[PDB]
């Protein structure tokens, strides 16, 4: 329905200020409190190449801590490159650049492999119809409903930003 693309993408208008609805795994406890994985975005830029820096935070002990990281373009296009926790690959899914986005990531620890996804929004939540959305996409991917963790109804350091 409305406006969605997924195909080719307008990075320049995706740049700006997002929030973190839903974050999934493939495993129960990469979703938990203490997780490295569980980021909250507050901001994306466009750089002069066209890779991407991301202004988050992640609970450092109860304390919202400011972490940024620039993801690299990579040879397939609508997928980045960066180093956090082991290496990772991630890619733009779909995007409403005034409503959502979905993001894919597989993150390759030395001798393991774990997929991620992430609904980021204009506003701190989104749609019905898209928080469903997310589910069929994740669905696809394996992730079941039971391992989609929602972060609307928990502390995403709102406070810190910025």
């Not at 995706?14 to 980021?39: F, H, P, Q």
């Not at 394996?142 to 609307?152: P, Q, R």
């Amino acid at each position: 329905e409305g406006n969605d693309v997924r195909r080719n993408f307008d990075v320049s208008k995706i740049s700006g200020y997002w929030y973190s609805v839903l974050l999934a795994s493939d495993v129960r406890e990469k979703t938990e409190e203490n997780s490295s994985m569980r980021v909250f975005v507050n901001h994306i830029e466009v750089l002069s190449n066209s890779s991407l820096l991301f202004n988050m935070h992640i609970k450092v002990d109860g304390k919202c801590t400011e972490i940024a990281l620039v993801s690299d373009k990579t040879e397939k296009d609508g997928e980045y490159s960066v180093e956090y926790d082991g290496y990772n690959v991630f890619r733009i899914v779909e995007t409403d650049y005034t409503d959502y986005i979905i993001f894919h990531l597989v993150n390759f620890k030395e001798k393991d492999s774990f997929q991620m996804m992430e609904l980021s929004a204009r506003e701190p939540d989104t749609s019905e119809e898209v928080r469903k959305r997310f589910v069929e996409y994740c669905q696809k991917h394996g992730i079941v409903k039971e391992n989609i963790f929602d972060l609307t109804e928990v502390d995403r350091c709102l406070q810190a930003r910025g």
